[PDB]
């Protein structure tokens, strides 16, 4: 007349690929077919096939964690160029043009500046 969780016990205690496959076959015990459309949408969202809502038009894009000062102030890369000549004028204009380019990353702008540096160095 007593519940099965009371009685004699052992009393002996007191308080790689193997793991990967173990977890994979744990995944199976709760592997049932989709039961309706909402579950299908949830499954695809978890898989990442579906867009996130509300739509963020810049989702998955962070521009390498760049800051605005790295895009708008690009004149620090013109230090190795002439400081008061006509090349200074042309490069100031070029960096003004690059700083107003929203389609380019900072890396592309700096490599443009470096190409100009190299071309003038050869000449």
């Amino acid at each position: 007349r007593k519940n099965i969780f009371t009685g004699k016990r052992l009393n002996i205690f007191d308080m790689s690929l193997w793991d990967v496959e173990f977890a994979k076959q744990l995944a199976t015990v709760n592997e049932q077919p989709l039961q309706n459309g909402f579950e299908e949408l949830i499954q695809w969202t978890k898989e990442g096939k579906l867009w996130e809502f509300p739509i963020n038009n810049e989702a998955g894009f962070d521009d390498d964690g760049s800051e605005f000062h790295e895009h708008i102030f690009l004149e620090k890369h013109l230090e190795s160029f002439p400081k008061q000549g006509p090349i200074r004028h042309f490069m100031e204009l070029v960096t003004c043009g690059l700083s107003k380019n929203p389609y380019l990353s900072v890396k592309q702008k700096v490599e443009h500046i470096e190409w100009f540096r190299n071309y003038f160095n050869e000449k």
Binding site: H112, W115, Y119
Partner: protein
């Protein structure tokens, strides 16, 4: 693209990407979205 631009700086139904005949064929069938002939 960048290389050719740098030197330069110092100095038909293409709207839908279809052949002009084909665009008529598609649009007559109603296939294109919102292209209603008037």
């Amino acid at each position: 693209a960048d290389e050719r631009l740098r030197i330069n700086s110092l100095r038909v139904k293409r709207r839908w990407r279809l052949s002009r005949i084909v665009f008529r064929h598609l649009a007559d069938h109603g296939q294109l979205s919102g292209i209603q002939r008037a």
